[PDB]
Amino acid sequence: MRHYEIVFMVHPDQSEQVPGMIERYTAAITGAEGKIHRLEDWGRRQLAYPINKLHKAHYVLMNVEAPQEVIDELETTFRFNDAVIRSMVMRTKHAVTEASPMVKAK
Template identity: 35%
Template sequence: MRKYEVMFILKSNLEEEQRKQVVEKFKGIIETNGEIEKVDEWGNRKLAYPIEKLNEGYYVIMNFKADKDVPKELDRNFRISDVVLRHLIVNIEEK
């Protein structure tokens, strides 16, 4: 299993309950073939530039271990989700 870090930005105008459901959905995708090490919710932050006419986004960072297929499935789900503004998945190398 490899170590990964994913950061995604959700629309800031979501209600808290919707936001929790989205985060749990992505946690569930990871937990099918991996394990979550840490979830860090930064909350609403100002974006560097407007995205979809929004100036703020809700930032979430997750560290996890998983098989190589999990990031592909995560990426697919991020792309089809209407509430995700941006996402980035990074493979963390052991040193």
């Protein structure tokens, strides 16, 4: 099992489905003997440049630990879902639990 940090962005006119999305992804990770170390929902933010003629995206952040296959399946889900417009997955050396700079000055 390895440690990952995930960020994803959602269409502003679909902000009502974010709780369901979070619940489903958390269940997928927990069913495979993994853990969740940080979860944060940043709300709607103004973009620095437009993406497909949009501004105002909805942001979610997670820090998790799990096997590789689960992460691959989650990536495929992001690819084929149309509410998600951009995402990023990165590897870390240790679990991170502290609070982010966006929940300290927003």
